[PDB]
C-alpha cells in the first residue's frame, strides 16, 4: 500500500475542519485535509445556516461575501407557546449559504498551502505504540487506498464521529454521548407566496407540545425564502421528528408555498458540554464530534470555528515543543474551555431545566417578564445566570399560586455558577482529568436529582 507523510491530517472539511486548516496555514507545516463529500457538496449538512456576527470578528475569519450572504440578520423574535408574548432580542448575525462559504474557506486555505482531497474517507485509525499516528484513507477519485501518517490528527467528522469511534475504548477521546444529551432536528427551505414581515429577524417558537425538548424556528433566508424547522430532545420516546413537523408546519409557517421546496432533511445535534478532553496522544477532536454545540439555542457553527482556532493554537504549540502527547496538545482544552467550553458547561445545566418546563411555566414567565429581554442575551453571551438576576426573577414567581419547577431557578443559578467554577479550574495536566471529571459527574448527578 502507498504511504504519505504529513504534519497534520484533518479529517472532515466542515465549519470546524476548514477553520482548523485556515488557521494552521502558512505556519511552516505540511497539512492534508480530507472529506468524503465532493467539493461542491462540502458543508451541506442539514442546518439553519444562521451564525452570530460576533464569532467572525473574534477569530479574524473572512466575513460572508456576496453570494455567501443570503440574508442579513439584525435580531431574534422569541415567541411564547400561546404566542401572546413576543421577545425581541437585538443581536446582529448572518443567514448564509453554508456550503458556498465553507468551500470558499477551503479554497483559500488551499491557496495558503493546505492540501485538500475531496471524495476521501478516513477508514481506519492508525494506532500503534499507544498513539494516533495517522489513518488509512480511501480516495474514491482514483479508487486508491492510501496510508497517511501524521503527527497530529484533527477529528472534525461531525456528529457521526466516524473516525474517533474506531479508536480503543480506553482513550478518553472516545467518549460517547447519552441519547438524552442530544436533539434530533429537521429543517426545510421553501419559497413564500407573499412576503415576509420583519425578514431581517429570526423567529423562535417555544412549545413543548409541538417540539418537546427543543423548539420551532422560522429563519428568513431572504425576501421570500425561509428556513423553517424544529428540534426535539432525543432518547425520550418521542415519535419521528417528521411527524411533529408535518403536524405543526402550518402553525409556524402558513405563508410558505409547499410546491417551491428547495432542500429538506435533518440530522442529530449534540446539546451538552464538550468532550471532557478534546485532545489526546496524537489527536485533537473539534466541532460536532467534540460536542461543541451551544446546549441552549443549539448553535454549533460559530463555536465549531472556535474549536478549530484552538486546535491550530494547540498544534503550533506541540510542534514548538516536539511534544504531541496529550500534555503536548493539552492547551487545546485550556483554550476552548476559556472561549466557549465553560459557557457550554453552565448552559448544559440550564438546558436540563428549560426542557422540563411546562407551556404554562413559559407562558407565565414570559408574560410576567421573569427576566429582561437583555438578560436573556447576557445569560447566553457569557453563559451566566447572575445571582442578582435570579433573585429578581425568584420574587416574581413568588406570586404564582400553583406548584411549578420555576421555584428552583435560584438553585439552578447556583448550580450553573458551581459547574462554571469547576471548568475555570480545568486540569492543568492530564494527570488530573480523571479526578476532575468525576467531580463534574457528581455535580450533574446531584443537579439531575434536584429537579425531582
Ligand atoms: C437541523 C439543524 C439545524 C442547525 C444545526 C444543526 C442541525 C442538525 N446547527 C448546528 C451545525 O449544523 C453544526 O453544529 C456544525 O455544522 C458543526 O460543524 P462540523 O464541521 O463539526 O459538522 P459537519 O457535519 O459539517 O462536519 C462533517 C464533515 O466531515 C466529513 N466527514 C465525516 N466523517 C468523515 C470521514 N470519515 N472521512 C472523511 N470525511 C468525513 C463529512 O462529509 C462533512 O463534510 C446550526 N448551527 C448554527 O450555528 N446555526 C444554525 O442555524 C444551525 N442550525
Ligand atoms: C436543547 C435545546 C434547549 C435547544 C436545542 C434546539 C435545537 C434543535 C437547536 C438547533 C437548531 C437550530 C436552529 C440552531 C440555531 C439556533 C441559533 C439561535 C443559532 C445562532 O443564531 P444567532 O444569529 O447567532 O443568534
Ligand atoms: C427556552 C428555550 C428552550 C430556549 C430559549 C433560548 C433561545 C431559543 C433563544 C435565546 C438565546 C439566543 C439565540 C441569543 C442570541 C445568540 C447567542 C446566545 C449568542 C451569540 O452566538 P453564540 O453561538 O452563543 O457564540
XYZ file of C-alpha atoms and ligand atoms in Angstrom:
555
model
C 0.000 0.000 0.000
C 1.097 3.566 -0.796
C 2.309 5.778 2.078
C 2.464 9.551 2.630
C 3.816 11.729 5.446
C 2.199 14.953 6.655
C 2.487 17.100 9.775
C -1.279 17.264 10.287
C -4.194 15.200 8.987
C -7.557 16.952 9.294
C -10.461 14.544 8.873
C -13.657 16.313 7.837
C -13.956 19.610 5.986
C -16.958 21.181 7.692
C -17.075 24.507 9.520
C -14.786 23.002 12.158
C -12.373 21.287 9.777
C -11.940 24.220 7.398
C -11.446 26.526 10.382
C -8.548 24.400 11.619
C -6.985 24.291 8.148
C -7.345 28.044 7.633
C -5.758 28.870 10.986
C -2.902 26.370 10.603
C -1.973 27.573 7.103
C 1.267 29.466 6.382
C 2.980 28.345 9.594
C 5.592 26.014 8.113
C 3.574 22.800 8.349
C 2.594 20.210 5.726
C -1.178 19.765 6.019
C -3.718 17.393 4.474
C -7.490 17.716 4.852
C -9.993 15.134 3.628
C -13.770 14.955 3.205
C -15.935 12.157 1.801
C -18.232 14.628 0.049
C -17.380 16.013 -3.396
C -16.009 19.574 -3.396
C -19.236 21.284 -4.466
C -21.197 19.476 -1.739
C -18.799 20.036 1.168
C -20.608 21.608 4.114
C -24.224 20.998 3.110
C -25.321 19.130 6.248
C -28.908 19.986 7.338
C -28.522 23.358 9.046
C -30.426 26.546 9.821
C -27.460 28.411 8.308
C -27.759 31.109 10.986
C -24.490 32.278 12.553
C -23.718 35.082 15.022
C -21.721 38.066 13.767
C -19.619 38.178 16.942
C -17.936 34.880 16.032
C -16.306 36.126 12.827
C -14.855 39.252 14.442
C -13.233 37.411 17.354
C -11.323 34.762 15.395
C -10.428 37.000 12.458
C -12.238 34.855 9.906
C -13.393 36.024 6.449
C -16.772 37.784 6.513
C -19.614 36.286 4.447
C -19.293 37.876 0.999
C -21.803 38.284 -1.825
C -23.497 35.010 -2.755
C -22.262 33.548 0.532
C -24.500 36.016 2.368
C -28.150 35.347 1.520
C -29.778 37.496 4.207
C -28.501 39.957 6.813
C -29.841 39.385 10.339
C -30.438 42.071 12.982
C -32.127 40.135 15.787
C -34.377 37.345 17.053
C -38.077 37.124 17.939
C -38.801 34.601 20.705
C -42.482 33.570 20.639
C -44.186 32.038 23.683
C -46.318 28.844 23.389
C -49.647 30.735 23.268
C -47.824 33.406 21.220
C -49.241 36.187 23.406
C -45.718 37.340 24.263
C -43.006 38.189 21.736
C -39.489 38.928 22.981
C -37.344 40.909 20.556
C -33.628 40.404 21.175
C -31.281 42.664 19.221
C -28.261 40.646 18.097
C -26.508 41.034 14.740
C -25.831 37.944 12.629
C -25.848 36.257 9.222
C -28.078 33.898 7.262
C -25.540 32.422 4.875
C -25.160 29.971 2.014
C -23.362 27.442 4.224
C -21.842 25.219 1.526
C -20.800 28.216 -0.575
C -18.987 29.920 2.298
C -17.417 26.695 3.565
C -15.926 25.930 0.154
C -14.524 29.460 -0.096
C -12.731 28.998 3.228
C -11.285 25.740 1.891
C -10.421 27.359 -1.448
C -8.377 29.974 0.410
C -6.650 27.558 2.796
C -5.671 25.617 -0.315
C -4.096 28.805 -1.652
C -2.220 29.285 1.618
C -0.579 25.878 1.245
C -3.012 23.332 2.679
C -3.768 20.281 0.537
C -7.386 19.161 0.201
C -8.727 15.869 -1.147
C -12.456 15.505 -1.785
C -14.144 12.099 -2.153
C -11.765 10.754 0.501
C -12.719 8.813 3.632
C -10.745 8.052 6.778
C -11.435 4.334 7.103
C -9.122 3.059 9.841
C -7.297 4.946 12.580
C -3.624 4.055 12.567
C -2.960 3.376 16.231
C 0.436 1.918 17.093
C 2.526 2.242 20.265
C -0.325 3.998 22.060
C -0.529 6.966 19.681
C -2.795 8.163 16.889
C -0.255 8.386 14.072
C -2.493 8.932 11.053
C -5.172 6.988 9.202
C -5.956 4.777 6.220
C -7.734 6.817 3.546
C -9.810 5.775 0.541
C -9.598 8.172 -2.404
C -12.694 7.413 -4.485
C -11.352 9.829 -7.115
C -8.698 7.291 -8.098
C -10.070 4.189 -6.342
C -6.892 4.038 -4.271
C -6.218 3.036 -0.673
C -3.553 5.339 0.745
C -1.965 5.254 4.190
C -1.343 8.742 5.568
C 0.943 9.333 8.542
C 0.633 12.429 10.718
C 1.977 13.806 13.987
C -1.490 15.106 14.902
C -4.919 14.033 13.650
C -7.692 16.626 13.717
C -11.032 14.869 14.145
C -13.751 17.025 12.573
C -16.126 14.348 11.298
C -19.276 15.966 12.687
C -21.950 14.274 14.804
C -21.151 10.888 13.253
C -17.736 10.674 14.954
C -16.916 8.130 12.260
C -13.169 8.202 12.909
C -12.589 8.524 16.649
C -15.275 5.931 17.416
C -12.949 3.378 15.817
C -10.297 4.052 18.463
C -9.826 1.807 21.543
C -12.471 2.350 24.285
C -9.938 3.238 26.995
C -8.975 6.508 25.327
C -10.819 9.444 26.955
C -11.087 10.832 23.423
C -13.673 8.170 22.510
C -16.282 9.462 24.964
C -19.823 8.814 23.718
C -22.941 10.911 24.316
C -26.127 9.753 26.014
C -29.255 9.841 23.848
C -30.833 12.451 26.118
C -27.764 14.690 25.748
C -28.640 15.270 22.092
C -31.520 16.551 19.969
C -32.726 15.346 16.589
C -33.501 18.318 14.346
C -35.163 18.648 10.932
C -35.470 21.564 8.510
C -36.704 22.642 5.080
C -36.186 25.669 2.828
C -39.204 26.842 0.830
C -40.399 29.952 -1.002
C -43.313 32.006 0.334
C -46.374 33.131 -1.637
C -46.453 36.566 -0.020
C -43.548 38.477 1.518
C -42.013 38.008 4.960
C -42.704 40.525 7.729
C -39.502 41.543 9.539
C -37.354 39.318 7.332
C -34.172 40.583 8.988
C -35.343 38.928 12.213
C -35.161 35.275 13.238
C -38.232 33.665 14.789
C -38.033 31.038 17.524
C -41.161 29.358 18.897
C -41.034 27.703 22.313
C -43.695 24.984 22.603
C -43.237 21.704 24.480
C -46.197 20.120 22.685
C -45.099 20.832 19.112
C -41.371 20.326 19.724
C -40.647 18.808 23.169
C -37.130 19.415 24.471
C -36.241 21.812 21.670
C -38.217 24.394 19.709
C -39.510 25.558 16.325
C -37.779 28.159 14.164
C -38.562 30.399 11.195
C -35.337 31.721 9.661
C -35.747 34.029 6.635
C -33.041 33.338 4.033
C -34.143 36.344 2.000
C -37.168 38.361 0.930
C -39.335 35.356 0.039
C -37.294 32.335 1.152
C -37.353 30.787 4.626
C -35.526 28.074 6.580
C -38.260 26.547 8.761
C -37.685 23.595 11.084
C -37.759 22.183 14.607
C -35.789 20.191 17.157
C -36.783 17.663 19.806
C -34.855 16.068 22.668
C -33.693 12.561 21.801
C -33.851 9.440 23.951
C -37.234 10.378 25.411
C -39.563 8.110 23.450
C -40.849 10.875 21.183
C -42.152 9.808 17.742
C -40.367 10.543 14.448
C -39.441 14.201 14.022
C -41.039 14.431 10.565
C -44.356 13.611 12.255
C -44.085 16.630 14.544
C -43.002 18.683 11.540
C -45.873 17.590 9.293
C -48.461 18.079 12.039
C -47.480 21.607 13.085
C -45.913 23.121 9.952
C -48.807 25.426 9.031
C -48.932 26.669 12.627
C -45.490 28.277 12.351
C -45.226 28.818 8.589
C -48.526 29.093 6.677
C -47.133 31.639 4.212
C -44.818 29.119 2.537
C -45.631 27.500 -0.797
C -45.075 23.769 -0.332
C -44.543 23.318 -4.082
C -41.495 25.601 -4.039
C -39.346 23.374 -1.823
C -35.582 23.616 -2.291
C -33.958 21.357 0.319
C -35.125 19.066 3.133
C -33.747 16.505 5.581
C -32.450 16.564 9.139
C -29.714 15.262 11.421
C -28.528 14.812 15.004
C -27.110 17.682 17.058
C -25.480 17.291 20.500
C -26.741 19.512 23.321
C -24.176 19.105 26.095
C -20.826 20.209 27.493
C -17.822 19.462 25.262
C -15.729 16.275 25.461
C -14.061 16.161 28.880
C -10.865 16.275 26.866
C -10.685 17.258 23.205
C -7.031 16.286 22.944
C -5.105 13.066 23.465
C -1.939 11.321 22.247
C -1.603 12.408 18.626
C -5.207 13.539 18.178
C -7.476 16.567 18.591
C -11.271 16.449 18.256
C -13.272 19.515 17.207
C -16.729 20.577 16.024
C -19.805 18.390 16.470
C -17.548 15.379 17.022
C -16.303 17.041 20.202
C -19.775 18.218 21.228
C -19.110 21.929 20.653
C -22.760 22.896 20.184
C -24.436 25.508 22.400
C -26.753 23.464 24.666
C -29.458 26.181 24.836
C -30.126 27.559 21.343
C -28.350 24.686 19.596
C -25.999 26.815 17.519
C -22.815 24.978 16.624
C -21.220 26.577 13.562
C -19.836 29.550 15.471
C -18.348 27.504 18.295
C -17.024 24.991 15.758
C -14.832 27.691 14.235
C -13.621 28.388 17.771
C -12.650 24.751 18.305
C -10.748 24.911 15.020
C -8.938 28.048 16.148
C -7.995 26.464 19.472
C -6.840 23.384 17.553
C -4.358 25.330 15.438
C -3.098 27.123 18.539
C -2.523 23.846 20.383
C -0.838 22.140 17.424
C 1.562 25.029 16.770
C 2.476 24.747 20.448
C 3.090 20.999 20.196
C 5.442 21.389 17.237
C 7.400 24.079 19.085
C 7.974 21.564 21.877
C 8.156 18.423 19.733
C 5.578 17.033 22.151
C 2.452 15.503 20.632
C 1.257 13.713 23.754
C -1.973 14.700 25.484
C 0.170 17.013 27.606
C 1.767 18.428 24.471
C -1.630 19.195 22.964
C -3.366 19.992 26.256
C -3.593 23.718 25.502
C -6.480 22.783 23.195
C -8.654 22.211 26.254
C -7.489 25.252 28.225
C -8.151 27.431 25.177
C -11.570 26.145 24.126
C -12.859 25.995 27.702
C -11.915 29.650 28.236
C -13.521 30.529 24.900
C -16.746 28.528 24.856
C -16.435 25.340 26.906
C -17.013 26.855 30.348
C -20.018 28.628 28.856
C -21.363 25.321 27.489
C -20.922 23.522 30.809
C -23.081 26.108 32.553
C -25.697 26.061 29.785
C -25.785 22.252 29.908
C -27.259 22.540 33.390
C -29.616 25.325 32.308
C -30.826 23.280 29.325
C -31.853 20.440 31.642
C -34.022 22.960 33.494
C -35.587 24.625 30.447
C -36.502 21.300 28.825
C -38.546 20.303 31.882
C -40.736 23.430 31.941
C -44.431 23.221 31.066
C -46.041 25.505 28.493
C -47.698 27.263 31.433
C -44.281 27.806 33.025
C -43.022 29.522 29.878
C -46.288 31.353 29.148
C -46.244 32.770 32.680
C -42.518 33.507 32.843
C -42.536 35.433 29.567
C -45.788 37.369 30.049
C -44.766 38.419 33.559
C -41.248 39.253 32.315
C -39.400 36.993 34.744
C -36.174 38.296 33.159
C -35.202 41.211 30.915
C -35.100 40.876 27.130
C -31.438 41.804 27.579
C -30.706 39.474 30.495
C -31.580 36.528 28.264
C -28.930 37.957 25.943
C -26.354 38.055 28.745
C -27.313 34.618 30.069
C -26.251 33.130 26.747
C -23.456 35.535 25.802
C -21.388 34.603 28.853
C -23.496 31.601 29.834
C -24.053 33.113 33.274
C -27.259 33.488 35.273
C -26.254 36.136 37.810
C -27.134 35.622 41.470
C -28.698 39.090 41.491
C -30.806 38.390 38.394
C -32.145 35.087 39.721
C -33.283 36.941 42.845
C -35.221 39.447 40.737
C -36.790 36.509 38.902
C -37.454 34.452 42.030
C -39.530 37.210 43.624
C -41.754 37.353 40.535
C -42.628 33.647 40.597
C -43.446 34.124 44.276
C -46.763 35.480 43.026
C -47.503 32.124 41.424
C -50.190 30.123 43.216
C -49.761 26.745 41.536
C -46.784 24.400 42.062
C -44.064 24.786 39.425
C -40.444 23.980 38.565
C -39.824 27.726 38.405
C -39.322 27.811 42.185
C -35.942 26.115 41.700
C -34.473 28.792 39.416
C -32.279 30.058 42.257
C -30.803 26.619 42.919
C -30.316 26.266 39.163
C -28.499 29.606 39.001
C -26.253 28.415 41.832
C -25.582 25.075 40.142
C -24.690 26.882 36.916
C -22.146 29.068 38.687
C -20.897 25.966 40.502
C -20.086 23.973 37.368
C -18.586 27.027 35.675
C -16.377 27.407 38.740
C -15.174 23.872 38.016
C -14.483 24.472 34.323
C -12.482 27.601 35.111
C -10.401 25.262 37.259
C -9.868 22.845 34.377
C -6.961 20.387 34.979
C -3.529 21.847 34.240
C -2.204 18.393 33.343
C -3.860 15.165 32.083
C -2.874 13.699 35.462
C -5.940 15.435 36.908
C -8.528 14.687 34.203
C -9.986 11.626 35.929
C -10.384 13.255 39.341
C -11.832 16.417 37.805
C -14.269 14.522 35.578
C -15.894 12.517 38.379
C -16.380 15.772 40.274
C -18.165 17.173 37.225
C -20.179 13.951 37.018
C -21.123 14.387 40.682
C -22.297 17.948 40.053
C -24.565 16.741 37.242
C -25.734 13.696 39.202
C -26.732 15.947 42.103
C -28.354 18.578 39.898
C -30.355 15.995 37.940
C -31.725 14.754 41.262
C -32.624 18.257 42.470
C -35.227 18.657 39.712
C -37.296 15.920 41.362
C -31.230 20.783 11.623
C -30.032 21.518 12.163
C -30.051 22.908 12.222
C -28.965 23.632 12.706
C -27.828 22.930 13.136
C -27.804 21.541 13.084
C -28.893 20.825 12.603
C -28.829 19.322 12.550
N -26.732 23.676 13.611
C -25.501 23.001 14.069
C -24.456 22.960 12.958
O -25.036 22.417 11.772
C -23.262 22.111 13.396
O -23.073 22.268 14.797
C -21.967 22.483 12.670
O -22.150 22.338 11.261
C -20.780 21.673 13.142
O -19.754 21.711 12.130
P -18.913 20.420 11.764
O -17.941 20.807 10.720
O -18.340 19.728 13.002
O -20.002 19.440 11.141
P -20.091 18.727 9.719
O -21.095 17.635 9.775
O -20.411 19.823 8.695
O -18.663 18.081 9.513
C -18.524 16.747 8.985
C -17.812 16.815 7.660
O -16.744 15.842 7.639
C -16.993 14.864 6.645
N -16.602 13.561 7.178
C -17.158 12.900 8.242
N -16.596 11.745 8.504
C -15.600 11.637 7.545
C -14.639 10.641 7.283
N -14.515 9.521 7.998
N -13.788 10.848 6.251
C -13.902 11.970 5.536
N -14.763 12.979 5.693
C -15.591 12.751 6.723
C -18.471 14.994 6.278
O -18.706 14.568 4.941
C -18.674 16.500 6.442
O -18.207 17.236 5.317
C -26.703 25.039 13.425
N -25.537 25.718 13.671
C -25.582 27.075 13.855
O -24.702 27.678 14.462
N -26.664 27.717 13.314
C -27.798 27.128 12.788
O -28.640 27.810 12.209
C -27.829 25.721 12.997
N -28.980 25.020 12.757
C -31.918 21.509 23.611
C -32.419 22.928 23.474
C -32.896 23.677 24.698
C -32.439 23.517 22.262
C -31.968 22.763 21.036
C -32.915 23.081 19.898
C -32.227 22.819 18.578
C -32.606 21.601 17.764
C -31.274 23.681 18.153
C -30.516 23.518 16.852
C -31.340 24.047 15.698
C -31.007 25.495 15.398
C -31.961 26.290 14.541
C -29.879 26.076 15.875
C -29.534 27.523 15.577
C -30.217 28.426 16.582
C -29.452 29.724 16.722
C -30.017 30.796 17.613
C -28.285 29.928 16.067
C -27.484 31.213 16.182
O -28.218 32.305 15.684
P -27.646 33.739 16.003
O -27.713 34.610 14.777
O -26.213 33.579 16.446
O -28.466 34.401 17.177
C -36.464 28.236 26.365
C -35.550 27.529 25.387
C -35.632 26.024 25.243
C -34.666 28.234 24.649
C -34.575 29.745 24.773
C -33.271 30.282 24.209
C -33.446 30.727 22.767
C -34.100 29.809 21.763
C -33.039 31.934 22.318
C -32.356 32.997 23.158
C -30.848 32.872 23.091
C -30.197 33.423 21.829
C -30.432 32.765 20.487
C -29.391 34.506 21.923
C -28.626 35.140 20.768
C -27.396 34.343 20.301
C -26.338 33.985 21.344
C -26.646 33.416 22.698
C -25.015 34.112 21.191
C -24.229 34.565 20.002
O -23.578 33.418 19.480
P -23.023 32.167 20.311
O -23.276 30.929 19.480
O -23.592 31.891 21.681
O -21.459 32.341 20.497
